[PDB]
C-alpha cells in the first residue's frame, strides 16, 4: 500500500495517512518509539508554514492537557 | 520497502524513519500536506505518555521559533 501510493486528492491523503498510521503505530510499545517519533515528526514538519506548524503544536498541547486530565 | 519493514533494533527504527521521511516529504507542496500532517502527527502521538509527548512538542516549538528567527532576519 504505502510504498506505491501517490496521493494528490483530499481522499488520497486521508487514505495515505490512515495506512501510515496503521503501519507506524504497530510499534507504539517499542522502547525506541518515542525517540523515533521525535526525529520523524520534526523531519516531516520542517517545510511547514509557521501557522501550520503552530496548529500541530497546539493540538499536541491539547492532547497533553487531555492526558493530564485523564 | 516501508510496508514490509519490521523494525526491532534502534538502527532498524533509524532506517524505518528515513524511508518514512523520504516518502512523506515528497508531498510537501500539496495543498493538503499540512492538513494531512496535523492528522498523522496526532494519530502517531496519541498513545505516548506526557514526557514523550512533551519532547516532541518542544522540538516543534523550537523549530517554529527558529523558522521565525530566519524569516525575521
Curated annotation (Swiss-Prot), chain B:
Phosphorylated. Phosphorylation is enhanced upon serum stimulation. It comes from the Eukaryota. Signal peptide: none annotated. Disulfide bonds: none annotated. It is found in: Cytoplasm. Component of the eukaryotic translation initiation factor 3 (eIF-3) complex, which is required for several steps in the initiation of protein synthesis. The eIF-3 complex associates with the 40S ribosome and facilitates the recruitment of eIF-1, eIF-1A, eIF-2:GTP:methionyl-tRNAi and eIF-5 to form the 43S pre-initiation complex (43S PIC). The eIF-3 complex stimulates mRNA recruitment to the 43S PIC and scanning of the mRNA for AUG recognition. Component of the eukaryotic translation initiation factor 3 (eIF-3) complex, which is composed of 13 subunits: EIF3A, EIF3B, EIF3C, EIF3D, EIF3E, EIF3F, EIF3G, EIF3H, EIF3I, EIF3J, EIF3K, EIF3L and EIF3M. The eIF-3 complex appears to include 3 stable modules: module A is composed of EIF3A, EIF3B, EIF3G and EIF3I; module B is composed of EIF3F, EIF3H, and EIF3M; and module C is composed of EIF3C, EIF3D, EIF3E, EIF3K and EIF3L. EIF3C of module C binds EIF3B of module A and EIF3H of module B, thereby linking the three modules. EIF3J is a labile subunit that binds to the eIF-3 complex via EIF3B. Belongs to the eIF-3 subunit J family. This is Eukaryotic translation initiation factor 3 subunit J. It comes from Homo sapiens (Human). The gene is EIF3J.
